[PDB]
Amino acid sequence: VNSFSGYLKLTDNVYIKNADIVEEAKKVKPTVVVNAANVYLKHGGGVAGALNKATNNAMQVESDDYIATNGPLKVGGSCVLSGHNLAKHCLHVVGPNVNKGEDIQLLKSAYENFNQHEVLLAPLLSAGIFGADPIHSLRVCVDTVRTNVYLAVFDKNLYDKLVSSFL
Numbered sequence: 001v002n003s004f005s006g007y008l009k010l011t012d013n014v015y016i017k018n019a020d021i022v023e024e025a026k027k028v029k030p031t032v033v034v035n036a037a038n039v040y041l042k043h044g045g046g047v048a049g050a051l052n053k054a055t056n057n058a059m060q061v062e063s064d065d066y067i068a069t070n071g072p073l074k075v076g077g078s079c080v081l082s083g084h085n086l087a088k089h090c091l092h093v094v095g096p097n098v099n100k101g102e103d104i105q106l107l108k109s110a111y112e113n114f115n116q117h118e119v120l121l122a123p124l125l126s127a128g129i130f131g132a133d134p135i136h137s138l139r140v141c142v143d144t145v146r147t148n149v150y151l152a153v154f155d156k157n158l159y160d161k162l163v164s165s166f167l
């Protein structure tokens, strides 16, 4: 039993809710919150901008030191950093951005990073301003992640479109 509440169960291990991941994180303080990152960990907008703002820019400061030491992530890759005031850890995961030209086959690889963590609070990867179809993304998530994932979908209209159509 964990402290998440109000989620619709999609499968044995995937749950979904119409919520802001930032507010969910502040309420639950999960072990792992997933950021929808880019390879540079430049947290400008979307989920990343919102999470970083909630940390008072501490996420960005930590991220810049990470990149200065290690260089950029791979598309489809991830790194574990601090969760600051929002969670124990933040798993920064890079889904492909098709508005940048990135290969959507890499979305499965991105979701595979979730399997290294027993429980996660996450957004849909590559959706929103990353330009991919959120219905597709949800399907890849369900077909790839085997650990317990709690998905927060902020957009109400999209959320309604997703659950009622989830096969």
Ligand SMILES: O=C1CC[C@@H](c2ccccc2)N1Nc1ncnc2[nH]cc(Cl)c12
Residues within 6 Å of the ligand: 019, 020, 021, 022, 036, 045, 046, 047, 048, 050, 123, 124, 126, 127, 128, 129, 130, 134, 152, 153, 154, 155, 158
């Ligand atoms: O509604 C959706 C579906 C796709 C995803 C998205 C991911 C990357 C960039 C833009 C959007 N998204 N946004 C969020 N999901 C949960 N919490 C959130 N807090 C603030 C925002 Cl934006 C947000």
